[PDB]
């Protein structure tokens, strides 16, 4: 795929206010960079190919 | 309908009542005329129109849900969200089939009530001075002009005016 025949899986973790995130590895860790803030809302998604509109 | 009043004993509607939607047509020495009665007309109305509001009524509002479509066979998971929508797509056609039925007939009822309700609301006026003909129409007793029409109309016909002239008519 795109040349190569290697993957990466993605996978996650939520933290808790007071958890603490611990991180080990002695190889193949593809790592997170920072963390996503979380909301909760209307929010979601759909699949749709209409145009959008004014 | 349950009265038997609209396609019953009124042989049929008047396409030329185009005011109102209960009404009287007369007879008399003046010639004929019509007249829309506004009190039954707007009762019906309000009526559908209470049941219009109960249904065109504020739908729900619905964010982040499941699925419900899928480009791959998975098995037992998709199979169950599958089958609770489907669930409920039935039961809300269910629903919705059996309320447009129920209204239907209640509707045609309560429309064939207030026919029935201003014809007995009629009878009751003239007393002693007219007849029910069968098909929805009185034959009054008495000499009765434009006015006269009126006032039964209106609601204010002193049937004791009259009383002496129609019972000699009546009975002979
Ligand atoms: C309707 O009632 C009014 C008020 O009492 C009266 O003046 C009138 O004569 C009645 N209408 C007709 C057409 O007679």
Redesign the pocket.
Known sequence: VRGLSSRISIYWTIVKPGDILVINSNGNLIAPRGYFKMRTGKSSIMRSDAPIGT | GIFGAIAGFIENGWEGMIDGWYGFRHQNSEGTGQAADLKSTQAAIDQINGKLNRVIEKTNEKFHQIEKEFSEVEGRIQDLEKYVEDTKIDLWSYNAELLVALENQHTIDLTDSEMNKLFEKTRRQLRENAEDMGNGCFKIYHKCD??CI??I??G?YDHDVYRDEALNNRFQ
Do not use: L
């Open positions: 434009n006015a009126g006032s109309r209106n204010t």
